[PDB]
Amino acid sequence: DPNAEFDPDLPGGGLHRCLACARYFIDSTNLKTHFRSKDHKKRLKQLSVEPYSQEEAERAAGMGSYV
Ligand SMILES: [Zn+2]
C-alpha cells in the first residue's frame, strides 16, 4: 500500500507492541505505561524475556540537582 510504514488495522500501526502481551498500543507512551505493572516485568525476569527492565535499568529515581 502506498505510503504506509504502519498498519491501518493494528493500533499504533502495529508498531508499538508489548511482545509479552501480543497487544498493540496506539502509542509508545501507552505501551511504556503498560509496563508499570511490577508483577509483569517480574514475570518477564522469570521467563528471561528482558533481564533488567523498566524502573530498574531505566529509573525515575535520581535527580541530584542543587543550585
Ligand atoms: Zn505486557
Domain ranges of the chain: 1-67
Which CATH entry fits the domain spanning 1-67: 3.30.160.60, 3.40.50.720, 3.40.640.10, 3.20.20.10?
3.30.160.60
Phi first, then psi, for residue 11 (nearest 5°) are: -60, 130
Residues 6+ positions from 7 with CB-CB distance below 8 Å:
13, 14, 15
Please give the distance, rounded to the nearest whole angstrom, from the Cα atom of residue 20 to the centre of ligand 1.
Answer: 5
Residue 29's CB is within 10 A of a number of other CB atoms, namely: 10
Please give the distance, rounded to the nearest whole angstrom, from the Cα atom of residue 35 to the centre of ligand 1.
Answer: 6
- Which residue has cell 508499570? 36
Phi first, then psi, for residue 24 (nearest 5°) are: -105, 130
Contact 14, 23 (CB under 8 A): no
Please give the distance, rounded to the nearest whole angstrom, from the Cα atom of residue 53 to the centre of ligand 1.
Answer: 12
Please give the distance, rounded to the nearest whole angstrom, from the Cα atom of residue 23 to the centre of ligand 1.
Answer: 7
Residue 44 three-state SS: helix
- How far is residue 64's CA from residue 10's CA, in Å, rounded to a whole number? 41
